[model samples]
Target chain A: LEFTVSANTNPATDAVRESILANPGFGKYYTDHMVSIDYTVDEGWHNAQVIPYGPIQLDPSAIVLHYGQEIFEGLKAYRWADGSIVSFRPEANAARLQSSARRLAIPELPEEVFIESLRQLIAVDEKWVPPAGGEESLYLRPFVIATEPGLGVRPSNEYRYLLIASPAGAYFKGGIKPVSVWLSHEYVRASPGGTGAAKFGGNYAASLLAQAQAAEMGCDQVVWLDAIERRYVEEMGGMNLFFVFGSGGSARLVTPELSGSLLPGITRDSLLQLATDAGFAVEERKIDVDEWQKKAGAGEITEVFACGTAAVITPVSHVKHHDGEFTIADGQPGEITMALRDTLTGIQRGTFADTHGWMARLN
Target chain B: LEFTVSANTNPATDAVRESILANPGFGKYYTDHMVSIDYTVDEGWHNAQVIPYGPIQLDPSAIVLHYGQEIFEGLKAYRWADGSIVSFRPEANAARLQSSARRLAIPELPEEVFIESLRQLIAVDEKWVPPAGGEESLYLRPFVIATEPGLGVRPSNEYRYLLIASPAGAYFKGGIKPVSVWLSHEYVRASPGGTGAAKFGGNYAASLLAQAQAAEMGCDQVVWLDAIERRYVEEMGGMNLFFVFGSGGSARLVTPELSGSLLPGITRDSLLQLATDAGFAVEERKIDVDEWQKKAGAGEITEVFACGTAAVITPVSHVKHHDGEFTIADGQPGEITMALRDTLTGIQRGTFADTHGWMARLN
Candidate 1:
């Protein structure tokens, strides 16, 4: 496949870069370059390139405009003490992209091609990888969009896969504060056997309003319920949820089981395995919100947290329900929550052992 | 509330229109003029304009690209005997669009604006409406898209609603051929309480692959099942389902009720009402596939048809499952199916009493 590389002569000023990276948020800023690979039903995936990160020209009738046949993956490249940059579990991201492609009716790139696209992107924009810090790393966004220019109600014949990197600071900028989430009464992020398990744009698109409502009600995030019963606790709009069973010796971790209505978050899966390795029994099954509320109120539940690639883990304080609000572990960040966050971040930043061969070197 | 109108000087020639309209099909061929209404969180819905129908330019990072914040509505402008154009139940379409907006997080257009959009488009290009013959009319597509250029996963502050007209002839170009719909075993279109009820792009986007599989297996369409069980019958990729119970005077029109797993199609609702006026006992309830097959085999199922804006009423003769195929009564277009088609077309073409008050004048 023929590939092209277009460099920007005038990159962001060092001062501007430093200022933006000082408190970088999720999906706000971008780097200098972006990688792209185009595909067609007839020709397959081709025309890979790394160009300056800027405006993308699209026709109004592009299938993504009307069909929402797009999927994206999130990963981070971390700087180590030896000046090496490594991304955590990129193969998993590639595999998830394939799964998403199968669900969205988009063509799936080969495993080698998917990894190569990320490598090509990181090769050109290596400088954008943020230096090692407490919780800072370069966020890599690998996304695919429908590129067909027809207005028909079917899958696009053409597509474009893009990889763009952005520098980031500490995820929980205000120091792991116990943020509140709104329990959505009306909206659902995904349904059983639907695209809820896929990391497609429509899932995130459907959650924006609920998330906004959460923010409007002084909550920072939104907690979705099952589409059928609206009682069982589904995952958050963008993260997998975890609940601490008890304290000390009985501190078992409980996460919602993947019941075909939740995205199998790579971070969430890793934490479960890692936590179990660290002497904790992790439970993955359907958890009713009512049960969780009752247990937490009775002081049996010790901690609550949410996990995602952007933030390894963040402690959740309370969930606002229609009847009232339920405080999780006395509305305070729990002990096990911090320990899990520290352990995960330490491993990602190369400060701990890479016992599971999880880190993939980008540089 | 501001509006502007622009005419197309290089519109399609008479020969081009006739050639394309000879077999316009559904959503393949487009008319010359289109209506657009832009809205912003600050300005509300404004800058209404009628422009030449052509390619629309979009930024690559538009919210509609990353988030699935898009919705659409479909209706038809029918040419009556006096050569005047009118639409069927335009208000229902407007209400459905609003319902879809609440689900997709897009801002809603005013009901009057939605109706006037069609009227404005037909005012200039009413000739595009097909002549009242052989069950043909003009299809109007009203769609809303997020236009903000950002990668943030949130509701877009800017949006655009477009109304594009397409001259459609008969759905079946040859004749009322029986289309064998393959029951999709792998793909599921919508979930309970998901965007299945919304006329959003994600649901259609999710069904493309299954539709492709049916086409590959030499089937004309794909019949989706309930996401959770895959046992009950859902709608086709675009249309809704209806199973007429028993023969003649004792017929009971049964369809899977709107249980949030199917779109509340405008034609589907109108068909139910139209059937009721024609003295059929309309019952919206759950209709499982096994019951349908058994009834058909026992002569209890007299007629089966699908309804939509594009194809008013299509007779179903066969249903191919993963294991085997089920043959329907007499394996041909039934009497009740043809009568329903004639009655609906008669109302649309101004041949019957306008007692139902479903028609809305376009010019």
Candidate 2:
């Protein structure tokens, strides 16, 4: 890692940053410093530096603003109870980012450099991390963008990779409220041979209109369908979905198999391992929407939830689509869903056993 | 149009600007000034200004950077033989931008404002327009992006609309050349109910890797197929494809219809009208790739070409895919292709009669 370090001369005051941390909402507030690394066709990757967090000066012809040559990753740094900060499965994020970069035609960054950049940023801005008591943490967003100024359709010759941290409050303010989702029959998220499996900006960009449609239709999230048949359940906008069969003792978890059209989410992977270890049958396969409707109607499928980094786990209470509306398990959060969420969060918070060795300490 | 104007304090010197314009490659050199308008949830659209062309200061969390929430339109300003500048069918671009805005969940600029922005910018930087003797002109790019600093998976409440211009020389250096294309079976551009028809950035972003594959295969461009069937011809990356049947006055032109998975290009529509008026039968219908191969093999399909603002008309000489490679009309530009290109460019350059009244004069 061609790394260098610099300090922000005017870092945010403790009182002001502390006030923000008290109730720091999702991604609106950022820390005082950011990590940056530059790449060019001539000089590979160099000039890795930690500088003040502020506006980036971009040429009007930057390729990213026009052709959308960008990819990003999302993870979190938790302030452990012992006053140390740890991240959960960050190597997974780094690997996923590399996959995304390849798919988007950007250069692959070494995983070691990715984690090093995070550590460097956290080292300079550790106070931004919230206390371990509440559901607050420093959400790390690492992104790579084409910075060369041009208006052509080809990939840019230069790029910049950056890591920025934001203090995030609990996704659910009061309690674990199950969300209602709108099944989008008119729009699709990704198709075969597309960047759906990659954490590229285009996938999220294509979903904004559909997400707005879901909001207009009185739903919290948009549930995507397969692009070809338009019948198979793909995923929630930014998260992976899971269905639980049965309840307390004999419950089994099932998620849609990665079909090159849905993100292979890190949270989804972790939950599968944890559920299997907890003595439950976990499987990944193609799950049709009609099959889901029929099973939920017959009380065979009990719980449905989405998993992501920002909102660790969210229960799906109901689904609304063009055809009609349906409820899952009497329109309430299920026991198994809440239990898995608690166990995962507990591991990240260091309150539960870390048998899987998934946590990586930054400091 | 809610427009205002400002002069650049230090504009480009005459010698430097003219020297750059002498052989201005596609999107490399820019004019002296640009047009901008801001939109927000509270004030709607405000602060319309035409200022010096320079870097834009964007927050690191700008939605366009992370989520790829951006759309743009490309048209050209011709320098007429009589020393006047004019734009071609800008309202078409305006309408398409609105369509793209709806698909990308961004605010739309009124069509009048869109045209007025071009007029304002050209009113000052008209000297940047290339002379009409050669195939040089001012390429105008109007775009919108989400500027609000946030990381949530929702549409930004703030947006920016900008118009920038660059002098573009002829697409081909010496003369018009027929290009060989690579058929991308392993990748798809857009699907039904996606942002394909819109001029959004995501569609272009998704095609870059496939394009790089085409380049690696020693082809000039990549040809996209329909996402569902993967049989029908869709587009040629940034351009629309057309096939010529027969030859001379008895020739017929056929292009793929707008399938909600391909852009409805203004140039494609204009060519259809021009061909029809020039006593050629024109049809918009889905053209299957296998049918093209078979017909070309049987010597029934005479020629194939692509249409767009940059190149106007580019002949397709050969095709390559995983299966094999084939040539069209012994790898040469066809008579009908050249005729249609001449007719279209004639009207654009003010050499032919503007019977359709498609030209919009700026000065």
The candidate that wins on DockQ is 2
lDDT of 2 at A47: 92
Whole-model lDDT values for every prediction: 0.82, 0.90
lDDT, candidate 2, A130-152, per-residue tens:
99866889999999999999898
Clashing pairs in 1: A60-B56
Q: Write the per-residue lDDT of candidate 1 for residues A1-363, one digit (tens) a residue.
A: 556888878888888877777767766678878888888877788888988887776655677877889988888888788888888999999999999989888888887887777777778777777777557778887888897865668888889988777776645556578778888887788765578778888887667767878888888889988877788887776889998988775589988888886889999999998888789888998888788888988888888898888767878888788767788877888988888788888889888898999998877
TM-score of chain B, per candidate? 0.95, 0.98
Tens-place lDDT digits, model 1, residues B1-363: 655889999989999988887778767777888898988888899889999987776555667777778988888898877877888899999999999998878888989999899889998888688877557788888999998876656788899899887777787777887667888887778766567788888877777778989899878889888877778898876888888787676577999988876888877887888778778898888877788888888888877888888778888888888766787788798887888888887888888877879888888
